[PDB]
């Protein structure tokens, strides 16, 4: 029940000196824009309904 409030996303915990910031952000954005995220959502979170 209820409605969405204090909406916020997820994240990846990395140290501030890690040089993998852009190399991971670009890959995440590419996966998001190539439809991998929606496919994973369909194949892992929408098994059955009521």
């Amino acid at each position: 029940t209820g409605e969405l409030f204090f909406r916020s996303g997820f994240g990846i915990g990395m140290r501030k000196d890690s040089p993998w910031k852009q190399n991971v952000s670009l890959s995440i954005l590419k996966s998001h824009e190539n439809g991998f995220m929606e496919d994973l959502d369909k194949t892992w979170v929408r098994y059955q309904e009521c």
Binding site: T1, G2, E3, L4, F5, F6, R7, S8, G9, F10, G11, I12, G13, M14, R15, K16, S18, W20, K21, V24, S25, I28, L29, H32, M37, D41
Partner: protein, 50 residues
Amino acid sequence: GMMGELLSGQADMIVAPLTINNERAQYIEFSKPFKYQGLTILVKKEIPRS
């Protein structure tokens, strides 16, 4: 917990559901969120019979 383990140097990258917060970001930088979901209320529903 996990944040302290990451700060201690035991772990370098975290792939787990972690909500981005200001206090967490003040010490550990995050990346772009995978998906945008807030917090709701879960209550068990009853079945009216008679």
